[model samples]
Target: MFKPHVTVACVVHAEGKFLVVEETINGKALWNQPAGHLEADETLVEAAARELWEETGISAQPQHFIRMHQWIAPDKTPFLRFLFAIELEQICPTQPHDSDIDCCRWVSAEEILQASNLRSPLVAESIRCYQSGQRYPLEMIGDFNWPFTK
Candidate 1:
């Protein structure tokens, strides 16, 4: 059975900087957006919101749906990553409730794209896509719950 892990990521921008979550893997710190796997019984937006809050303690919601990517990691893990965009008027201080996230930083897109310590290439890809002015309505992808609706 080939089941790709469903994930959600948010690109939060404020005052010309983007929010990045730092995590230590294999004794090396890597940067990534507020991202994580989706849980059962939750909408994609909810998952993104939860991850953002969990990773950065920021309670902002995604305003637009960016795009989704079908990717396979170097470890052979397949993923279906849903990307979202949230624009804040100003930068906010963050405290990580999730231990997996060491800290949060606000940096420029160029810094992320040019940096070598990224959790994955998707991190920079997301920034580039966000900078390209590519955003769709949140309703682009609908989630119907278990109850049938006509």
Candidate 2:
């Protein structure tokens, strides 16, 4: 029983560009936002920040929730992606990006729109939501429900 794999992605904008990851996926190069799958016993905020660090090395936490994207993969696997947005003054690149990310780069939304190899359509969709300034309060998520008892 494969359920929708929940994931988290961050939209980090600084200077005039959004933070993106240039990755080599299955022998094809593609661009995508700093993102990864959500893990067990973690809040969305924790997952988002952890992914941001692992993928982009940005230590800042997400400032706002942009929106959720429900994408069904070609093979029928589904992805429930939670998108977040945060603003910074500049970018400081770091090393050891989870072994999968080829590199991280800053690009304007126009460049993203023009790019040919995007890991998924949600890349542009999240960026557009950020550009539109649409955001949901962090409180929208709700109280914690621990899967394990103390």
Per-model CA lDDT versus the true structure: 0.93, 0.85
- What would the per-residue lDDT of candidate 1 be over residues 53-90, giving only the tens digit for each residue? 99999998789999999999998999999999999989
Best by lDDT: 1
Best by TM-score: 1
- Where does model 1 exceed 4 Å of error? 145-150
> Each prediction's TM-score against the native?
0.95, 0.91
Candidate 2 lDDT over 8-30, as tens digits, reads: 99998988888898889899989
Which lDDT value does model 2 have at 50? 93
